[PDB]
Amino acid sequence: SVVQTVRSSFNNINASISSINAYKQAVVSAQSSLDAMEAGYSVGTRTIVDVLDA
C-alpha cells in the first residue's frame, strides 16, 4: 500500500505542473482578447456588452 501511495502522489505532482502551464497560457489568451475588444470599443466598432463579457 505504501508503494502504490507514494507512486500516485508523485504522478499527481507532475500533473499539477502541467495543468499550471496550461492555465497560464489560457490567461494570456483571454487578456489578448480583452485588449482587442476594448480597443474596438474605444474606436467605436463594438458595444460595451462585449467588454463586460471579455
Under rule CB under 8 A, residue 31 binds other proteins: no
CA distance linking residue 1 with residue 38, whole number of Å: 55
Ordered alpha helix ranges (H), 1-54: 2-43, 49-53
Under rule CB under 8 A, residue 46 binds other proteins: yes
Residue with Cβ nearer other proteins (29 or 42): 42
Under rule CB under 8 A, residue 48 binds other proteins: yes
Residue with Cβ nearer other proteins (29 or 45): 45
3-state secondary structure of 47: coil
Cα 10 to its chain centre, rounded Å, is: 24
Q: Which stretches of the chain bind other proteins, using CB under 8 A?
A: 44-48
